[PDB]
Amino acid sequence: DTAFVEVVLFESSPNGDYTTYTTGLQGRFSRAGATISAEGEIVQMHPLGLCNEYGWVGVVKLEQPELDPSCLTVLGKAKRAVQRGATAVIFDVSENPDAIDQLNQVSEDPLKRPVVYVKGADAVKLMNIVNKQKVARARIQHR
C-alpha cells in the first residue's frame, strides 16, 4: 500500500558546481495503477496540457472541482499521463479527497505504471520542490 517517495533537487552554480538536496515523503499506491518501483525526472501536468519524450514522473495537483475546470476525470488524467510516456504519476489530492475513492475502485484493467497519491505535509513538501521549477527527480518504492 504505502509508497515511499524520494525527491532529489538539482541546482547548478554559474561556476559549474552543482548541489543536490534529497528528501523523503510518503504516499499510497492507488488500485488504478501498479505497485512497482519507478524513477524519473518530474514534470508537472497543468490543466491546459492535459486537455490539449519518455520516462518522466508526472505530478498533478488537484484543485477544488470549482477551481479545476477539467476535460478528464482523475483516472482519465492518470491514463493520459501514462499514454504520453510517464513512468508514474503522483497526484496531490489535498484539495480533492474524493479522488482517492475514484483511484481505489477495483479496476478490471488497471494501469501498468504506479499511480500514487499524496496529501498533507507530504504533499506540501513535494509541491514546494516542484514549484521551484528546477531539475528534480522522484523515486517511488514499495517496501
Numbering used by the authors: 31 to 82, 91 to 181
Show the paper's wording.
Rspo (R-spondin, also roof plate-specific spondin) proteins are evolutionarily conserved from fish to humans and have well-documented roles in a broad range of developmental and physiological processes resulting from enhancement of canonical and non-canonical Wnt signalling. ZNRF3/RNF43 specifically targets these Wnt receptors for ubiquitination and turnover, hence reducing Wnt signalling responses. Direct extracellular interaction with Rspo proteins inhibits ZNRF3/RNF43 activity. Here we report a molecular level analysis of the ZNRF3/RNF43 ectodomain structure and its interactions with Rspo proteins.
By using a combination of heavy atom and molecular-replacement-based phasing strategies, we determined multiple crystal structures for Xenopus (x) Rspo2Fu1–Fu2 (highest resolution 2.2 Å), xZNRF3ecto, zebrafish (z) ZNRF3ecto and mouse (m) ZNRF3ecto, (highest resolutions 2.4, 1.6 and 2.0 Å, respectively), plus complexes comprising xZNRF3ecto–xRspo2Fu1–Fu2, mZNRF3ecto–mRspo2Fu1–Fu2, mZNRF3ecto–xRspo2Fu1–Fu2 and xRNF4F3ecto–xRspo2Fu1–Fu2 (at 2.1, 2.8, 2.4 and 2.7 Å, respectively). The ZNRF3ecto crystal structures revealed a distinctive variant of the protease-associated domain topology. Two β-sheets (comprising β2, β1, β7, β3 and β4, β5, β6 strands, respectively) splay apart, accommodating an α-helix (αC) at the open edge; two additional α-helices (αA and αB) pack against the β4, β5 and β6 face of this distorted β-sandwich. A disulphide bridge, conserved across species, links two structurally elaborate loops, β3–β4 and β4–αA. The resultant single-domain structure is relatively compact. The crystal structures for apo xZNRF3ecto, zZNRF3ecto and mZNRF3ecto showed no major differences in the main chain conformation. Comparisons of ZNRF3ecto structures for proteins crystallized in several different crystal lattices, or for crystals containing multiple copies in the asymmetric unit, consistently highlighted an acidic region (N105-E114; residue numbering is for mouse sequences unless otherwise stated) within the β3–β4 loop, the short αC–β7 loop and the extended β1–β2 hairpin as flexible elements of the fold. Our crystallographic data provided independent structures for multiple copies of the ZNRF3 ectodomain in eight different crystal forms. All but two of these crystal structures reveal an extensive interface (average interface area 992±109 Å2) formed between two ZNRF3ecto polypeptide chains. The interaction is twofold symmetric; strands β3 and β7 of the ‘subunits’ abut face-to-face at the core of the dimer.
